[PDB]
Structures are given as structure tokens and as C-alpha cells.
Scaffold this active site. Structure first.
Site: not given
Ligand SMILES: Cc1ncc(C[n+]2csc(CCOP(=O)(O)OP(=O)(O)O)c2C)c(N)n1
Ligand SMILES: Cc1ncc(C[n+]2csc(CCOP(=O)(O)OP(=O)(O)O)c2C)c(N)n1
Ligand SMILES: [Mg+2]
Ligand SMILES: Cc1ncc(C[n+]2csc(CCOP(=O)(O)OP(=O)(O)O)c2C)c(N)n1
Ligand SMILES: [Mg+2]
Ligand SMILES: [Mg+2]
Lengths: 535, 535, 535
Positions: C27, C50, C113-114, C392, C419, C446, C448, C452
Site C-alpha cells: 500500500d 521480502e 495498519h502495519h 550463516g 535439502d 540426505n 535432513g 546438525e
Molecule cells: C508481508 C507483507 N508484504 C507485503 C504486503 C502488502 N500487501 C497487502 S495485500 C497484498 C496482496 C494480496 O494478494 P492476495 O493474497 O493475492 O489477494 P487478492 O488478490 O485476493 O486480494 C499485498 C502485497 C503485506 N500485507 N504483508
Molecule cells: C535461518 C537459519 N535457521 C536455522 C539454522 C541452523 N542450521 C545450520 S545448518 C542447518 C541444517 C542444514 O541442513 P541442510 O541444508 O540439509 O544440510 P546438510 O544436511 O547438507 O548438512 C541448520 C538448521 C541456520 N543456520 N539458519
Molecule cells: Mg541435507
């Protein structure tokens, strides 16, 4: 004069133990001021500046357990920052009330005086957050319960609180409280207290000798009597550090002097560090209190109790109120019982002062030779010893004294201050005069900051100060000084003038001439440690 | 496996009403995780990302009144910021626990991963202060009482809390609580309640007709039954706004629809704005809820009750618990008695959905046509309507739904989400599948953000989105999807699929094709007001 | 369409090197969005959420040296926090622009809002201060010079910047800049540079052998070529750590592999730690890069250069730009010269990938086996290796890859992701599809979080993840996927598929099946150190 928020606040102040309000008027708090003047329970005490006011409130709170300060938005509150900080550092419950512009004016973001000129009104409120345990911006919708919340938090933690009172909110209607704000601190979880008890017992059960070390926190939490009674019933070696000086009658059995690390006397060091188990109650080992952290106490050797947690060895038991932990320790301890004159100098000065102090006295000493000299005074019973070693802001004592006198009109107040220190808050002496107080003030005139000289640059210009004519100050800050001034330079004279005033029928100011380099025993140690840190 | 802080925390979680813990593992919380897995009272629910986890916790809390989220220092916690913020904005009690490096490592200021690389470890903690009502950095000396303090504050204010749990602190010894954490909210000062009562009575006593307007805060404070009972005993016009939708059985007498300012129907507008005295309970007049602040209610005409204060006319009575104020109002009120088919469109879609909802449902609708279409649904009894109009973060509902299903395994969950919104949190659909939940998910496919188009730049590229193949998503986020999918475009198709999935024997995903510019009645109003603000 | 602030901002973006703007509409930023769409120099790139957008901008900036992100007040900006934080942690210049309510509406403190529903609009702005080097709330009176100030500070420090752009301010009139925003970094004080030079010379003059260790900061400050040229002209042992991997052609003489403390190979450890003087350029010794701080480099043995200061032994010379310090070191150095398988496993997987990488490649690897396996890849010339070891945050690389492709349409992008990691940002794969990018994405399946598992709780439920059907994701996030997908379990199959996709004529997704406990060499070391910290 319908009952309003302003009245509600005052009532809560009285509930907390305050009978006076310190501060200096300001545009934004005038209307509120009317209410405090019309209140029959709160007395207004205007001060020379808000820094002094905050010091005064601190002193007052160290006597009555609670105090309130009233300043004006921006210029008033910031001037008191150092005071509140000190109160927060040393756990002194001081309520800071700041009169502010009306809520509507604030919303509008106008260029009001006492602001930074940016339309922002929460800057100072946020700046005060680190030095308070609770704060709030009073509004028409939260007034009463927010007021009760901060006050309650204050009483629990024994620290400063902050309330922004917009002028219009002060006028809003309110209804008188039916019940006084209750303290009622919660009890500890029985299971946790048991675990602490068992651990303590096992430790004390194998202890050959036990010693008690207590400090300022017991004073703040009203457990003085508990400790005096403890040591009386269970005789043992016991001491306090500079901050807690005054909780014990130092003339009793088991007291060998004040503890301060390796800088302590052999007797004290032995009595305390010598025990195989030492109880640390409301203890805080700062650098100034331990001569540079030279205390010899180990985790295994100690048991410490803090406001909300206690420790035995390496284990902590969180969630145990200080008073209950002390109670448990007392029960267990009973369960394991075991068998000249001439020219003045720091030396003869403190020796003379020793024969002068009497029970019921209120003694305040500022940073420097005053505090580290007074640490050796052997205190009688019922004496309130006020010092500020942790925060350590010079100038504090002179103003704090004004606050103490205001709280205890019928107690003899002895003010020990250096000449450097007194200069920072001198104008409060004018307030003592205006209110016709009779404190006995001793200014240690050694022509400067000898403690600083002792630390570094003994002959440096920055350790000098403008040389004042102390004995003539009262007649300058008053049109009719109910005061008596003397300049002493010999032990004899000092002892002489002391007896002439030992009953304080007037404000008495004694200028004590001392050597520029003369330093008290303890101070030498602390001084050598401080410069060691600079290198 | 000796009892430790980690265990103490979990026990308190259960005391607060949580049986699950959402989050994603991380180096610093693995050891703590063991304890939650070994706990017989807390179930671990790993999510696809922390943002979704926080949304799920919010949804869970809207069902059980409390929830907990577990993330890892830095990378985990910041990813959940938007979620916690939303919880704080809409008063949802979600506890955020963040596993952190050991206290020693933090003191050392090491270049640890998940830090800004400056040796600082309190940045994120401070960043979380504006969106929590209480927070604490757990230490070996404060663990238990700080844990109880934040939780207690959370229950009182109904808002997010924050706990930083250093890994080593988690392992510290603790003793099980003898008593569950009590809520026991304090009662109001009898005198203040009286003043409120008298003022309310005088107002109601001269009222020709009275109307009730309630919103989300009554849901958060568990006063849903109190209000239903109220309106049942004392028949009168009553409504809620979008946020509080669900507190009333909208099929009962006195309900004419949901209130939303001038954008309301004439019936509602008259029933509410037409009364000479309207009771606003737990009300918050946001721009989205009032169609740009077009509500016609005046101070004199109203009586509002907030969590800790109530108002009648221009006077506020602070220090009165919401529940007691409502109680008082109920007593006083009794004293004043006063007598489809074809091509799919938003129009026929909502009409169809109306015949589908049943008691005991849990309906969630995201921002956009979903929420402003669902606002017209006439809800049966015992239905939990979950919407987030104040914070308004799209993507929220899909993840929130996962949380709601987790909390209510045996209730039918209807998810109304837009195609734009579902893209932000799609991966949580994989969690629904993994846990074999049986949501009935409806994706409104109108090829983009129609609400945004309605506000500005209807033909602008920025309102378009990647066009997905929704009915094929389940088989992509699972190796064996226990689900059914449908792409509907006719009212009859939707009608039939809904009869098929009525008993949710499987996850069912319905892609509802709708016109790019088709907008619900209410939405047009709100839309015109938003762009008016942009100009 | 008169020239306004919105246009000025965009022009400055282009001046800084950005040709695209990532984000998601809202908005409060729609009207501003029109300008970016009408701009012939900035291309709008809408993302799924975002968080992904911020990761994409980060990746983009790692290719073009600068990037911009556009979100909406509250909900948008908070969702991007983790991204901006990562950019700040790793010195990536990303500008965060957040569309906000009009200045008048903000002054009024309305329930928009927001917002948190308290009338406050600076919460999020303040929350973003610790993760940006400069920020500003744009007003009608400061617009242009504040815009120039944060951008300038960003270019200098190579870090994120923040601009709150109120909708009305965006429409305010402005005039086009005559000159492009200049970088022009100031030179060092000749005397200081001299002192550094002399100290460095004395050190190098007595050095038997010298080695060069360089990292990410040289990449951020555009000194890649300076270092390549350096090592080419003055042959010597040289390496980089995980973060700076890519600055050197690792096939050249003097390169023995990537340095990572004691976890390095004997050859590397000897070549670097073995020299009596090692030059550390743009170096940062984090725990992950040094296998728990096991690097053997002493102050006397090193000479380090940071962005604004350099060090030789124990002496620091502040005020010296990195580029000039490097230049000085080069001159002095010239003055001292000196003498197949079947079943897939981490082992054969990396070996296969090795024969696949080619010059001009852009390789991104996420946390876990991907990053700690890729660290052993011997890189050809002109390859941009993107990894995020300090912050990281998993999930980062998938989104970052989208950003990189956007910046380099004609370069082959190889995405190495686990994964677990890919699940957090999967929806951005939909954006790659929409924009018809031709990534070659390898998902290490693999089942999981094996990293970890390697750290703790190998058989614990919390290390498992919902098992997805990776090869079917593209056809789910697109109606016409311009892609190819393969599940691979044999080394023969991997090689074959890699040959098929060599020229990336389409998005290619390769699901690489690997053992749940299979861990790369280096990872074992790092893993053992991390759990050691947990105990
Ligand atoms: C995290 C976040 N990012 C951006 C917005 C701005 N925003 C409000 S409604 C909307 C789009 C709504 O899309 P949708 O689920 O398609 O609804 P419809 O077309 O059914 O109205 C956006 C981008 C928000 N509220 N929250
Ligand atoms: C946002 C976020 N949440 C949680 C962690 C903790 N963390 C580090 S490695 C990892 C798992 C990595 O999984 P994956 O991509 O499967 O790798 P692999 O099994 O190849 O080591 C997690 C949960 C992080 N670094 N960032
Ligand atoms: Mg993995
Ligand atoms: C507000 C404040 N400013 C500066 C200092 C630093 N300081 C500590 S002791 C001291 C001098 C003490 O002077 P004085 O009262 O003369 O003591 P004496 O010579 O009696 O030791 C100073 C300046 C301080 N503690 N507080
Ligand atoms: Mg002096
Ligand atoms: Mg849509």
C-alpha cells in the site's frame, strides 16, 4: 479541588514511606506543585539545583527507605541524571517524577522550550531507561495502574523509578485508593529452599570455623536487625565492607574491623579469609571495596545470598528471597556451634573523630581521604553510615546530608567531605541554612584532590582547585546564618571545637587544615592499585 | 538426566497452556531440544522456516491462549521478527525462546557465527524489545525467577515475551516447581469500580436504546462466554468488527452483521450507530476496521472498556480489570430493559461458502479479497474466526492454519487465502502434509494482488505474480500426499467439491479461479480510502 | 510526471551500480513503484516474500557491488531483517527502502495498519539501526542530501543502508543531479603511510619466506585484480579462507588449497603457517573459518590490513585505506624475492563436481555439507564463489542465486544447496522460472540436516525434515516450466546429467541422493569443535 491523578500519585508516595518531595519548580510542574503544597502528608523541599535534589533524595531514601524527586522536562531531568544513576548503582529507591508538556502538545510535535527542537518528546525518557528498573509515560488511560506498577517494582528491586507526568494528565479525575500499596514479597518455592538448605547444611556441618561478611544490600532490603540479631545469638567473626558499614555495632564481640581485601588488617583478614566457610550476605566485590580485587575468598569456601538467589559452592539456587535465605542460614548456624596532639594529620584527625562519634549518629563521607579514612572508625550502635563507593560521585555527600537531615530532624548528622568535593554541591549548604538544620560539617582542607595526587600527577596543575575561604561561606549563603564556623589546624583545637558542638545547637562548619600529601593507610593501597590499572 | 533449567522452562510452558513447541533447530539449541523431546508434556514441531514457525505459534495461541517458539541466535530470531511483531500488535501471547552461545563465550566477545562479527551479543535482544512486553537474558543466577517473571507478564498483558537461553545456562541444575505458575489477576479498587459503576448507571439510566460493540481484546482475555451470556440474557443490538468476528453466534437475535464504519450495511449502521449509548468492549478502531476512520461514535455516546481501564463519556477510570468492568455493565443493563450457479465471482463464491461453514469450524482468512469477503460470512456457534487486520501480514494465514490444526486436531480448519499470500509461506503446506493434517484450503486464484490493483496501478506489472500450478503443489512437497486437489471455476463445481470434502478425510486443496478485478463490496470502500491517503 | 524525490532516489541507485530493484509491493510504496517502472534505468523485480528479496539483493550486490531492496512499512521491512543483518555481517552494500505512511498521518499517531497499534512510527526504524551503517527518515526538508549521505556512507563502509520514504515525500518536487554521486575515497596521511611502510619493510627485510592470506573484504572493496596481479608478479604461497574463496585462480602456482586453521591440509598449513611472515589482507578469523579458532598465526609473525587500518606486529596504523596499504606491500615485496565409482557419496560427488566447474561460473553454496564440501573445489579463473560463513543463514543461497542470475544473465550459475536449506526459500524457485533463468541447481538430498546430526542428536527427530519430491517442484511453481529435472543416485548418472546441462539452455534441477550421515572431511573437524563448545 476535586481529587485527581496528581493527588493519587502523592498518596502512593506517602504509602511508600516518603513525607517530602525534593526538586526545583518548572513551567510544566507548577500546577502539580499546588497539590503537593496542599497535601498534608507530603512536604515540598525546593533545592538549589536538580543534581543536588537528586543527591538529597538519595540520602533521604537511605534513611526512610524511599524518596521522590520532582524535576521539569528536559533541563530538569537531565541535570539529575548522575543522581539517579548513583541511586540505581547502589540500589536506592528514588522515584523521579518529571512534569511534561500536555499530551496534545506532544502529539503535535511543536517546537517547545526544553526540547531538542525536533518535535520529539521521548528522548529523555529513553535516556533514563538504563538507570531505572521501571518507568512509564502517564496517560489519561493508564495513570493509576502504571503509577502503582513502577512504585511496586521499585519496592521490590530497591531501585529508581521514572514517571513522566504530562501537565494535563495530572489534572485528570481519579478516585482515592482504598488500600495502601502493598509490598508483600512472594515466598520461595519450598522445594528450592529445601535444596538450598540441604546444600548449606552439608557445607556448614563440616566447617571448623564460620565467618559472616555482609554489605549494603542487607541495608537496602531492611534486614539490618535480622543480621544484628543473628550475630548476637550465634557469636562468630563478622564484618562488612565499606558500603555496608553500619549494619553492625562494631564495639561488639566478633568484630575486628572493616573488610577490604588484602588491604585489611591482619586481624580482619584472618577472622574472615581464615574461616573455612564464609557467609557473603548482600555482598558486591567492587574494585574500590577490595583494593583492586585482592580478596581471598573461593567458591568452595563461600555461601552467598543475593536479593533473589543464593549460592553454595558452585551451585546457585534462584528464586529464593534474601530474607528467607538468611533465615535458613541462622537456623543452621545454631545447629553447628563452635568455640597525642600537635599539628593535624590524617592520623590524629581520625583518631580524634573516633572519640567524638556517638550512638544515633548519621555519618556521611565523600570520595577521597574522607571515605577511606572514615572506614576505620569503630561505629557504636544505631549509627547510619552513608558512603557511595560503587558509583563514587564526589559532591554527593554534602547534598545527601541535607536529605538525611530532612528525614531525621532529631538525629546528629556528621558530614565528612573533602574541599574538592564540597565545591560541586556547595549551594545546598544554603538550603541547610534556609531550613535551619544543625549538621556538623567538616571540610578536609588539603588544598586540592589529594586522592588524585596519590594516583597520578601529584604536582600537576589539574589536581589543584580554587582555594576557598570556607568559614565565610555560611554568611554568604544566608542573611542570618544560624551557624558557627572554625578553622582548625591542631589536634587540640579540633578536639576542642568538637566538644563545643557535640550537641548541634546550630549549623557548625569546621575547616580542617591538612597536609596536601597526607593520605590514610587504606587509601595508599587502593591508590597504588588504581594507577596500576592505568599502566 | 538431572532436572535442569531447560526442564524448568518446559514445565512452565505446560503450566501456561502450551503442549507444543514450534521452531527450527540450530547449533545453540540442540541440547535444549533433547529435553523437549524427552518431555512427556511438550511436543516438538519443526517447521520449514522460522517466519512460518512464528506464524504457526500465533495461530496456536489463538486457539489455546498461549504458545512458544524456539529459534537460534541471530539467524533464527531475526527471521521470526515479523511474526512476533504481529503477535504483539494483535495481543497474542507467544513466548520466543532463542538458544544462544555460552555466557563465557559471550563475555569473551568472540567472532562466533550468527553474529555481526563485532563481538556484541545483545543487539538482537535489544531489537526485540519494542515487540515484547517482557524479556530477559537468562543467567545461572536469575534463571527461574526471570522465567516466571516474563511468563507472568505475558499472561497479564496477553503479549509476546522473549527469553535468551545461553546453552550452558540450560544445563544448570534446578528444582521442579511445587506450584503451577498462577495467573490470579488482581481485583480493582472498590472505590474506583464504584465511581465507574455510578457513572455508567447515570448514562444507561437515560438511554433510550443501548448497543454492544465488542472486538478481539475480549477473545484474548478469555471473555467470549461472558459476552455471549450477556447478550443472551440482555437482548440488544450487538456486533463486532473484523478482528473480533467469532465471539458471537451471528445467527442469534440482535445481530445484524459485522460493523465497519460507514462501509457497514444500513441495518448494522443503524443498530449500532443509532443507539444513544453504545458499549465498546475490547475495541480498537484501526483504519482497516473502520474504512478509513468513518465510524460515527462520539465520546458522550459511548462507554468503553479496555484491559485495565474503562471510560464513560470523557471520564476514564484507570485500574479496573476488563472482566470486572464487563460484570458491572451486565448488572446495570438488566436494570434497564428496552424491547446460485454459473461462472465464479466473488459474489457467488462467498454465497456458496456461506452454506458450507458449520459449528466448531476454525476459519482463517488472509489480507485481501479473502478477509474482506469473509467479513460477510454469517457465523454459526462455536467457530473460531482467525484474521489479522491490524498487523496485516500476508502469508500469515497459511502458516497460522498449521498452528491451529496442531492445537485442534479434531476440528475442521478452513483456510481462505489469496494466491499472492500463499506464495510467501507455501513451504508450511509441506508441514501440514508431513503431520497428516486434513485442512480444507481454498486458494483464490485471480492471477495476482487484486486488492493492490484496486488501490493503485491496476494494470501495473508490480501487481502480477509468478503464476503457479496450485493443484500440483502437494505432490511436490510430499512423497505420498494424503490429499485431494481441485481447480474450480463454476459455483456448481465449488458446491460439489465442498460437499465431497465436508468431512476432511484428507488435506484438500481447492484452486478457485476468480476474475482479476473482481472485488468484494466492503473492499471497494476500504480500497478507495487507502488511495485517498496516498494523495 | 514532474521530476520528484522518487526519481532522484532512483537516479542515485543507478549511479551506485544498481539496475534492478527487488522487493514486494505494499500500500505505502505503490505510487513510488510507478516511478521505478517508468524509469528506463531501473528494473523492478518482484519476489515471493521480502526475506527472499533481501537475500536476492545480497546476491546481486555480490556481483555488481551494490543493490537495493524495497519493502513496505512494518510487515515488509521486518520480514527482511535477517537478510539485512546478513548483508551487514558480511559487508554487502544493500540499500533498504521502505515505503511509509505520510508524514502528516505519522504526526497524528493514528491506528494505521502495519503498526503496533500505539501511534508510534519509529519502532522499526530504530530496530534496524544495529544492522545498517547509515539510515534516515526522509522528509520534505532533507530528502536529497540525506539520500546522498546514506548512499555515500554505504559505498565507503560497504554495508547496508536504510531509508524510510513517506509516500507524500516521494511525490515532492526535486531537480535532477548534475553529477553522479562520487565515491572518491580519501587518501592516507603521508606520514602515517610512511610509518606503516617503514615498519612493514623492516619486517619483510628479515623474512626468510612470506605468504599471503586474503579474504572477503578484498572482494567487497574491489581489490580482486590488485591481489591477483600481486601474486602473479611476486610469486609466493597464497590462500584465502572460505569467505574469500574466489579471489584467486587456484590452478596457479603458489596455491595449495583453502586455509582453515588446523583443519587445513598439511600442504596449506605449511605454506601459510610455515612462513615467518604472513600477510593477512581483509581477513576475519571467525570460528567457522578457523575450525574453532585453531589457526596458528602470531602477532609478531603477521601484518594485517583492514579497510581503514593496517598492522605490523603489535603496532596499528589507523587512517590507512586498504588499497594504499596493499599497494605499499606490493612495492616492498618486489624488493625482497626468495627461492570412477558407483553409489554416490560426499567423496565422489565433490570429485565429480570438480571436473564440471568452468571459468566464468557463479557458484553458491549454503551452510552444511554444501559449503564445507565446496571449500575443497579447485577454482579456475574468473569464477564468483558466493558463500555466507559468518552470518550463516540457511536458505540464503537459493534466493541469493536468483539475485546473481538477475545481475549476470549470461553467466552460468551453479547452486549447491542442502535439502533442509532449500525448504526455507523454495518459493523463489518460482521467480527463477517466471523470469526464465537457467540455473543449474543441485539439491543434496540426505534426508535432513546432516551437519546438525554431526554436531548432536544424530538420531533425534528434530534433525529430520518433511521429505519432499524435489524433481516435481518446478512443474508446481509454474504453468510451463522451462526446465529439466533428474533424481541421481549413481556417480555415472551425475556425470551424465552434468554433461546434458553443461550449457544451461534451461533451468535444471538435480536431486542428488546422499547418505544421511555422510560428511565431508573438513566438516568433521568443524563439527567436533561446535559440540565441544556446547559442553
Ligand atoms: C508481508 C507483507 N508484504 C507485503 C504486503 C502488502 N500487501 C497487502 S495485500 C497484498 C496482496 C494480496 O494478494 P492476495 O493474497 O493475492 O489477494 P487478492 O488478490 O485476493 O486480494 C499485498 C502485497 C503485506 N500485507 N504483508
Ligand atoms: C535461518 C537459519 N535457521 C536455522 C539454522 C541452523 N542450521 C545450520 S545448518 C542447518 C541444517 C542444514 O541442513 P541442510 O541444508 O540439509 O544440510 P546438510 O544436511 O547438507 O548438512 C541448520 C538448521 C541456520 N543456520 N539458519
Ligand atoms: Mg541435507
Ligand atoms: C562528579 C565526579 N567528578 C570527578 C570525579 C573524580 N574524582 C574522584 S576523587 C576526586 C577528588 C577528591 O577531592 P577531595 O574531596 O578534595 O578529596 P581529598 O583531597 O580529601 O582526598 C575526583 C576529582 C568523581 N568521583 N565524581
Ligand atoms: Mg581535599
Ligand atoms: Mg489474489
Amino acid at each position: 479541588t476535586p481529587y485527581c491523578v496528581a493527588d493519587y500519585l502523592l498518596d502512593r508516595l506517602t504509602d511508600c514511606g516518603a513525607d517530602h518531595l525534593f526538586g526545583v519548580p518548572g513551567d510544566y510542574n507548577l500546577q502539580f506543585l499546588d497539590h503537593v503544597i496542599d497535601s498534608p502528608d507530603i512536604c515540598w523541599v525546593g533545592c538549589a539545583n536538580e543534581l543536588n535534589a537528586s543527591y538529597a533524595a538519595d540520602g533521604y531514601a537511605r534513611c526512610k527507605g524511599f524518596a521522590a524527586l520532582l524535576t521539569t522536562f528536559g533541563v530538569g531531568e537531565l541535570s539529575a541524571m548522575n543522581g539517579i544513576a548513583g541511586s540505581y548503582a547502589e540500589h536506592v529507591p528514588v522515584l523521579h517524577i518529571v512534569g511534561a508538556p500536555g499530551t496534545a502538545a506532544q502529539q503535535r510535535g511543536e517546537l517547545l522550550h526544553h526540547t531538542l527542537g525536533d518535535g520529539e518528546f521521548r528522548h529523555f525518557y529513553h535516556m533514563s531507561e538504563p538507570i531505572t528498573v521501571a518507568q512509564a509515560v502517564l496517560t489519561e488511560q493508564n495513570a493509576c495502574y502504571e503509577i502503582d506498577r513502577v512504585l511496586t517494582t521499585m519496592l521490590r528491586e530497591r531501585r529508581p523509578g521514572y514517571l513522566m507526568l504530562p501537565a494535563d494528565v495530572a489534572k485528570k479525575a481519579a478516585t482515592p485508593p482504598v488500600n495502601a500499596l502493598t509490598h508483600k514479597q512472594a515466598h520461595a518455592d519450598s522445594a528450592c529452599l529445601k535444596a538450598f538448605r540441604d546444600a548449606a547444611e552439608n557445607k556448614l556441618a563440616m566447617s571448623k570455623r564460620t565467618a559472616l561478611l555482609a554489605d549494603f544490600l542487607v541495608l537496602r532490603h531492611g534486614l539490618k536487625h535480622a543480621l544484628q540479631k543473628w550475630v548476637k545469638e550465634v557469636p562468630m567473626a563478622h564484618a562488612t565492607m565499606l558500603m555496608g558499614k553500619g549494619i553492625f555495632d562494631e564495639r561488639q564481640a566478633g568484630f575486628y574491623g572493616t573488610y577490604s581485601g588484602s588491604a585489611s588488617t591482619g586481624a580482619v583478614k584472618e577472622a574472615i579469609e581464615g574461616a573455612d566457610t564464609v557467609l557473603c550476605v548482600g555482598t558486591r566485590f567492587t574494585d574500590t571495596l577490595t583494593a583492586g580485587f585482592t580478596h581471598q575468598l573461593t567458591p568452595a569456601q563461600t555461601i552467598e545470598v543475593q536479593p533473589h538467589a543464593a549460592r553454595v559452592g558452585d551451585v546457585w539456587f534462584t528464586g529464593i528471597p534474601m530474607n528467607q535465605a538468611i533465615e535458613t542460614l541462622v537456623e543452621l548456624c545454631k545447629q553447628h556451634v563452635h568455640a597525642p596532639d600537635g599539628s593535624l594529620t590524617q592520623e590524629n584527625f581520625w583518631r580524634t573523630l573516633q572519640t567524638f562519634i556517638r550512638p544515633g549518629d548519621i555519618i556521611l563521607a565523600d570520595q577521597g581521604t574522607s571515605a577511606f579514612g572514615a572506614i576505620d572508625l569503630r561505629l557504636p550502635a544505631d549509627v547510619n553510615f552513608i558512603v557511595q563507593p560503587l558509583w563514587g560521585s564526589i559532591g554527593y555527600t554534602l547534598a545527601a546530608a541535607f536529605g538525611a537531615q530532612t528525614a531525621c530532624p532529631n538525629r546528629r548528622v556528621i558530614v565528612l567531605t573533602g574541599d574538592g568535593a564540597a565545591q560541586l554541591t556547595i549551594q545546598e549548604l544554603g538550603s541547610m541554612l534556609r531550613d535551619k538544620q544543625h549538621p556538623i560539617i567538616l571540610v578536609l582542607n588539603n588544598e586540592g584532590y589529594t586522592v588524585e595526587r596519590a594516583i597520578h600527577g601529584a604536582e600537576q596543575r589539574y589536581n589543584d582547585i580554587a582555594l576557598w575561604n570556607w568559614t565565610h561561606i555560611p554568611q554568604a549563603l544566608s542573611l542570618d546564618p544560624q551557624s558557627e564556623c572554625w578553622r582548625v589546624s591542631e589536634a587540640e583545637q579540633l578536639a576542642d571545637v568538637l566538644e563545643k558542638v557535640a550537641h548541634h545547637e546550630r549549623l557548625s562548619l569546621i575547616e580542617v587544615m591538612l597536609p596536601k600529601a597526607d593520605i590514610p593507610p587504606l587509601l595508599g593501597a587502593l591508590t597504588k592499585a588504581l594507577e596500576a590499572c592505568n599502566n
